Amino acid sequence: NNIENIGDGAEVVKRTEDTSSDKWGVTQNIQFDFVKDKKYNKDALILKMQGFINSKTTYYNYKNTDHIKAMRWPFQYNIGLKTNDPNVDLINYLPKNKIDSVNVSQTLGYNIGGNFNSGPSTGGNGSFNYSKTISYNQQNYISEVEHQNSKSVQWGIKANSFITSLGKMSGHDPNLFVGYKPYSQNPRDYFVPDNELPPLVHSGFNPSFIATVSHEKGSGDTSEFEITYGRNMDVTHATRRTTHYGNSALEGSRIHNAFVNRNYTVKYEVNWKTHEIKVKGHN
């Protein structure tokens, strides 16, 4: 339906899937680009994983106590791709290396014969028959590949370094996001305002990741892929201790990994012969 000629007898067959979950607060917008090149001895599929993961940050009374309030927030965003097809191999993924740049912008370039290049989106690596670019912001967060093998890749985009009213804080600091004194008994009012929170905490994350897989020609028409987007959430408790003597400022405590793997997983079936992509299921 949507095919691009990429020169020298090759073409790219493009398909996009877009699926949202109100339950998980996730949109997976996936681009599936089949590279049809007679000069490359395997079938190739480039996946560009975009969409949005809501932060799902919430505020509540800890055990409905009078003076302990809680903030549930995304310590890490999860992006993962996996297959169970023995005929498929993961051949590249971007970003490949740990990266803390506020903006991550990279390009995967393809040249006839199964040649792939990873480099800056600004170029300087050469001319390609086809290319795909990723771009995402991750202010105060850091991206890393948590694991990768021939069948899967998982990234974590985690809370890293913050500028607070008390100076620099790591993503593990128990006082992170805790206010000075409550403005009211509303649980929100024990934590700093939205302007003092990064977009990844107040709003969410706009992923932009690439993975390329190869498939043995003539080995089977279909493969299943599971793509997972989600969050691992931490809880910060802020406690107001009344004293006529010391510091009555709020004190923070952290429950690290309070609600892990809150993920939306979608199973996609890829047909290497027809180029039909279909959703097989989801949670």
Author numbering: 2 to 284
The authors write:
The mutants exhibiting significantly decreased binding abilities with respect to wild-type LukS-PV were: R73A, Y184A, T244A, H245A, and Y250A, with Ki values ranging from 1.8 to 6.2 nM, i.e. a 69- to 238-fold increase compared to the Ki value of wild-type LukS-PV. Four LukS-PV mutants (R73A, Y184A, T244A, and Y250) displayed significant alterations for all measured parameters, i.e. at least 50-fold decrease in affinity for hPMN membranes, 2-fold decrease in the slope of Ca2+ influx and 2- to 10-fold reduction in pore-forming capacity. The Y250A mutant crystallized in 5% PEG 6000, 0.1 M sodium citrate, pH 4.0. Crystals were orthorhombic, space group P21212, with cell parameters a = 85.30 Å, b = 84.29 Å and c = 38.09 Å and 1 molecule per asymmetric unit. Crystals diffracted up to 1.55 Å. In the case of the rim domain, wild-type LukS-PV and mutants T244A, Y246A and N248A displayed only small differences, with r.m.s. deviations comprised between 0.20 Å and 0.30 Å, whereas the structure of the rim domain of the Y184A and Y250A mutants were markedly different, with r.m.s. deviations of 1.10 Å and 1.28 Å, respectively, when compared to the wild-type LukS-PV structure. Of particular note, the rim region was generally associated with weak electron density, and could not be completely built in most structures, except in the case of the Y250A mutant. In the Y250A mutant structure, the removal of the tyrosine side chain allowed the displacement of the N248 side chain, which in turn drove the reorganization of residues R241–Y250. Space was therefore provided for the displacement of the V179–Q186 loop, which adopted a conformation close to that observed in the case of the Y184A mutant. For both Y184A and Y250A mutants, crystallization was achieved in different conditions than those for wild-type LukS-PV and the other mutants, resulting in a different crystal packing.
With the exception of α-hemolysin, which is homo-heptameric, leukotoxins are bipartite toxins, formed by the non-covalent association of two distinct proteins, a class S and a class F component of approximately 31 and 34 kDa, respectively, into a likely octameric species. Panton-Valentine leukocidin (PVL) is associated with necrotizing skin infections, such as boils, and plays an important role in the poor prognosis of necrotizing pneumonia. Two additional structural domains are also found: the rim domain anchors the protein to the membrane surface, while the stem domain, closely apposed to the core β-sandwich in the soluble form, contributes two β-strands to the pore β-barrel. Since the binding of LukS-PV to the membrane is a saturable process, the necessary presence of a LukS-PV receptor on the cell surface was thus proposed. This was recently confirmed by Spaan et al. who showed that the C5a receptor is required for the binding of LukS-PV to human neutrophils.
